Structure 1
Amino acid sequence: DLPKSVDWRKKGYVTPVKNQKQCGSSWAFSATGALEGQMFRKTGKLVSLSEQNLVDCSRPQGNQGCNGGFMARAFQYVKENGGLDSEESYPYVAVDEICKYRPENSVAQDTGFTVVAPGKEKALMKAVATVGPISVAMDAGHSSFQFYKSGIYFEPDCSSKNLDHGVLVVGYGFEGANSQNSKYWLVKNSWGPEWGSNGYVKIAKDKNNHCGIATAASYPNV
């Protein structure tokens, strides 16, 4: 059955927290985070992937670089493109630039992606427990989120349907000795390690799909 808690950071699947800066590229960080987890599961090597490669090259698939995008379109680009470059070979500069994809520097691939369906928290829990980190969209458009520091985040103004930010669910847990209450999703953000709880946020779990975390979740197939 499903584990009481999961934290893929403790298993080597997750890279250190990154910073998208003033570019609307959270979708690219969410997609490289999911791909980093799946490549690690497949090869045993954790290699940081290039968000800039996605920002600069995936316009044909429907992404708009620093003006926004979608994780599923990014996984589609990696499939059609045949690869994705490492973060070291194609560094992040937080502005839209010319596509400079280099096949010789590719370190990741995908054949498509799987959508978490239904858009229910229990389905997301199954996906997190069996696959690894999962890309998700959420409603991060709140001052309370910008100033979040620690604890379980809950915001009455949060929408489960109108989402504006891509993040990565790396696990789930609970506070205390009881696994069924004070539950939370472990979410990796892309605002730097100085934001939030070391770059992470605990989003309330089993509180009616709070902030939309299970509404548009997906992961690459590697």
Structure 2
Amino acid sequence: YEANYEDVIKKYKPADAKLDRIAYDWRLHGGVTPVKDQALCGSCWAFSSVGSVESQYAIRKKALFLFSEQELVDCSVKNNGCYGGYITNAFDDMIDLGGLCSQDDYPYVSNLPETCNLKRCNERYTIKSYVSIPDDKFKEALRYLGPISISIAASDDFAFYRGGFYDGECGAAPNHAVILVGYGMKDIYNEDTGRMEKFYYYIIKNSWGSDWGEGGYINLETDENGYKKTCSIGTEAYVPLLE
């Protein structure tokens, strides 16, 4: 089920397009659905992977789709519900189960035990495959393929984050799943040097509610190429594909 990047990008990047590497934010280009809260349940793997698919649908169909994390939590036997999971395992089960359900059909129930039961899903919403995004292609993947389901090494400093550019510590190891939604640059004046300088960053949609971070999102430093990986973001990096 996993497609190969070099095959997938030749299909979706217009031939010889030049990538604008300074700024591109899916929230200003119709690729991001509202922020969710996983509450008291270790289901980031679902939110990340499912939000990914919400984002592909939005981009490819110019229509708002809200899908059900709880379905994956209840049904994805390759993951551990509220005790963690894996991005690829999440994509595999979306496919082997015959698709996502709408959030309406199958609402979030956090850590309440719930039987897996697809008969409560009327319409089903499929993906065809998913693709791993190489470490040196995140900006290219973002612009042309869409938001990326990614791992991140979170630390207890994330608790305090409520906007700006994060300068807390990182986790020892990758331990949380988020969605990469864009990148930006701010020209910051430097009082010492008396020169303007450029500050690049990646933009990430978290699943801890809109009261965490910047309306739900976190800004992390990177460089012009987008090779710098603050908090080990994207060690696992996947985009779902609708065809």
Answer yes or no: is the 8 Å Cα contact 1:39–1:108 preserved in 2: no
Answer yes or no: is the 8 Å Cα contact 1:14–1:46 preserved in 2: no
Q: Hey, what's the Cα distance between the residues in 2 that align with 1:124 and 1:102?
A: 38
The reply on whether 1:24 has 2:42 as its aligned counterpart is yes
The residue number in structure 1 matching 2:216 is 199
- CA drift at 1:93: 0.6
Q: Hey, what's the Cα distance between the residues in 1 that align with 2:82 and 2:170?
A: 26
Which of 59, 63, 78 is residue 79 of structure 2 equivalent to? 63
The residue number in structure 2 matching 1:12 is 30
Secondary structure class of the residue paired with 1:135: strand
Identity %: 38
The 5 A counterparts of 1:31-42 are 31-42=49-60
Which of 118, 141, 153 is residue 155 of structure 2 equivalent to? 141
The reply on whether 1:110 has 2:130 as its aligned counterpart is no
Q: Hey, what's the Cα distance between the residues in 2 that align with 1:13 and 1:20?
A: 20
The reply on whether 1:153 has 2:166 as its aligned counterpart is yes
Q: Hey, what's the Cα distance between the residues in 1 that align with 2:121 and 2:84?
A: 28
Structure 1 unaligned segments of length 5 or more: list them. Answer: none
The residue number in structure 2 matching 1:99 is 116
- CA drift at 1:43: 2.0
Secondary structure class of the residue paired with 2:181: strand
Answer yes or no: is the 8 Å Cα contact 1:135–1:168 preserved in 2: yes
Q: CA 1:10 to 1:78, structure 2 compared with 1: closer, same or farther past 3 Å?
A: same
- CA drift at 1:29: 0.6
TM-score with structure 2 length normalisation? 0.82
Q: Hey, what's the Cα distance between the residues in 2 that align with 1:78 and 1:23?
A: 20
The 5 A counterparts of 1:123-138 are 123-138=137-152
Q: Hey, what's the Cα distance between the residues in 2 that align with 1:154 and 1:177?
A: 16
Superposition CA RMSD, Å: 2.1
Q: Hey, what's the Cα distance between the residues in 1 that align with 2:228 and 2:118?
A: 41
Alpha-carbon displacement from aligned partner over 1:53-89 (angstroms, at most 9, x marks no partner): 0100001xx2000000112111111111221101111
Alpha-carbon displacement from aligned partner over 1:86-142 (angstroms, at most 9, x marks no partner): 11110001024211224852342112210012xx2x311111111111100001122
TM-score with structure 1 length normalisation? 0.89
Answer yes or no: is the 8 Å Cα contact 1:15–1:33 preserved in 2: yes
Q: Hey, what's the Cα distance between the residues in 2 that align with 1:41 and 1:208?
A: 26
Q: How many residues align?
A: 214
Which of 33, 49, 63 is residue 67 of structure 2 equivalent to? 49
Q: Hey, what's the Cα distance between the residues in 2 that align with 1:104 and 1:19?
A: 22
Which of 188, 197, 216 is residue 236 of structure 2 equivalent to? 216
Alpha-carbon displacement from aligned partner over 1:145-204 (angstroms, at most 9, x marks no partner): 111122211334444xx21100011111011289x8311111000000011111110011
Which of 174, 181, 186 is residue 175 of structure 1 equivalent to? 186
Q: Hey, what's the Cα distance between the residues in 1 that align with 2:45 and 2:123?
A: 20
